[PDB]
Design a protein around this ligand. Structure first.
Ligand code: B1E
Ligand code: B1E
Lengths: 257, 269
């Protein structure tokens, strides 16, 4: 099975921490990442292992195993480099249009696979798209934790309204992908001009606010700008599905190279 | 689970073909490789899916799924680029020592993982080490041949010509009809290390295959370790010699192989 016996993993350097969980770099048949969980977090651990063991895709963080003794741990592959957010907004790594579209294609592949497996990511954003060895996209959920300040920009109008106390779906994931596409094609975050977070939460929820699509770079293909606008629509039933998103991106990638 | 429904995979270009198995490049949530088998190869298919679904490692070919309708199909990730054999021997891709050691380190990681999962590779060679995007090692078994004796308990080197260089002395002897082990896999890895550090295949000066089969089996033949390049680390040459020993019980295990290479890599920076 995927259960890793006690004493096999060599837990190294502490990478990040929050309440509930701590991530480490470790050794287990090469480089690995280990996420340690509190004994209280047993159900959450079981649900996270259950979702991760359903995935075998190049563009999804590779699940490798879990441990139950001495503590609850989730073992994945070690990602090398930084997130797409870091590249676009923290560093100033100026990518060529070819590479931008490739990242978008690799992300659509990962998202399309998840949806086919009946998995909603629930928190798709550039901070959750790892650029492994500066080339391969690895979609994961790297968060550890008003409290959702780092996810509001990618939140669909109905998610912000918490519309049925169950506002998450394949369509809300499509919306977040439209925001990732915005980031890639403009090189910036949406609502950069707006100072208050409560203004964003209120105006997006009401329908009074949407990203400025005139901010896209001059070499942004026409098909990409249309698809981004289709992904960002207010009514979720108007948004496309990922099989259509991916085929549109793949057809665009070949038309460029 | 991992069964892929009919009509999902778009089977594209034919990459390679052999007795029993044909491989294709396809589309299924991005790029994929599809291996179609004959309906008569059902047991082999089940055994191959069974072994592949036990693996989740960066340095092992990523299994993605399978289909049984209209034909038996094994779906894996699509590898980009060429094999380590192609880089070292068919081309002249001249790697720096840093990269050579990294390839060996990534291969020892993959091999160590397999052994921990109680998987003997059975046919490790530079042709089965894919250099994905010219950087990440992906160990798989890319052979489509199936050549041997189906009924032959003791059997043939006229169909195993592409694997004899990596075959341990006891594998060639087929002694006990049970010659495959973790130790025979360690031997093949010693030959991959030879290839990396010399830049050449062992016994390049010997013309007859039957001469190689006879002399290696008898103990009368072993690779010329003076052929290693001048910047080959001392630790690497010793480890290669330890991996290539005639008595299999004298060969090291991969946890140790890995530990020696990893410390060596950091010792080079
Ligand atoms: C160690 C770990 C274990 C589990 C998870 N879990 C997930 O990412 C996840 C959890 C639930 C659901 C999903 C889905 C399937 C929705 C996706 N994608 C993913 C993340 C991690 N974090 C993790 C993994 C690899 C890493 N490599 C390099 N660096 C520098 C890191 O910071 C790092 C962090
Ligand atoms: C499509 C396929 C399905 C299954 C396997 N099977 C194995 O690799 C395998 C079969 C049995 C056992 C093992 C083990 C686990 C021992 C290893 N390693 C591996 C290979 C392939 N071949 C395959 C896979 C990806 C490819 N990408 C690029 N290129 C250009 C190819 O030629 C290609 C070929």
């Amino acid at each position: 099975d995927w259960e890793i016996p006690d004493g096999q993993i060599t837990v190294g350097q502490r990478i990040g921490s929050g309440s509930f969980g701590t991530v480490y770099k470790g050794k287990w048949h090469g480089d690995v990442a280990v996420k340690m969980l509190t004994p209280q977090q047993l159900q959450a651990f079981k649900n996270e292992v259950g979702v991760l063991r359903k995935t075998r895709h190049v563009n999804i963080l590779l699940f490798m195993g879990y441990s139950t003794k001495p503590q609850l741990a989730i073992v994945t592959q070690w990602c090398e480099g930084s997130s797409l957010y870091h590249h676009l907004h923290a560093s100033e790594t100026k990518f060529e249009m070819k590479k931008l579209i490739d990242i978008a294609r690799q992300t659509a592949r990962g998202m399309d696979y998840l949806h086919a497996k009946s998995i909603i990511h629930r928190d798709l954003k550039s901070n959750n798209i790892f650029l492994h060895e500066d080339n391969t996209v690895k979609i994961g959920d790297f968060g550890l934790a008003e409290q959702l300040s780092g996810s509001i920009l990618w939140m669909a109008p109905e998610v912000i309204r918490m519309q049925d106390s169950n506002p998450y779906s394949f369509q809300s994931d499509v919306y977040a992908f439209g925001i990732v596409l915005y980031e890639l094609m403009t090189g910036q975050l949406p609502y950069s001009n707006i100072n208050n977070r409560d203004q964003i939460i209120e105006m997006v929820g009401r329908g009074s606010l949407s990203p400025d699509l005139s901010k896209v770079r001059s070499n942004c293909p026409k098909r990409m700008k249309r698809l981004m606008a289709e992904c960002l629509k207010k009514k979720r039933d108007e948004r496309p599905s990922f099989p259509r998103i991916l085929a549109e991106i793949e057809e665009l990638a070949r038309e460029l190279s």
